[PDB]
Every structure is written in structure tokens, then in C-alpha cells.
Amino acid sequence: SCATTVDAKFRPNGCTD
């Protein structure tokens, strides 16, 4: 899972969850 603990805008743009 990509957006999970920290932030979606910190992790890569268009990542698979």
C-alpha cells in the first residue's frame, strides 16, 4: 500500500496502493 502512514504528496505521483 502506497498512501498509508506519512503522506500521498510525499510518496511518488501515481503510485499503486
Q: How was this structure determined?
A: NMR
Cα–Cα distances in angstroms (integers) from residue 13 to residues 1, 5, 6, 9, in the given order:
14, 16, 14, 7
C-alpha cell at 4: 498509508
Cα–Cα distances in angstroms (integers) from residue 1 to residues 5, 7, 11, in the given order:
10, 12, 11
Q: Which residues contact 8 (CB under 8 A, 6 or more apart)?
A: 2
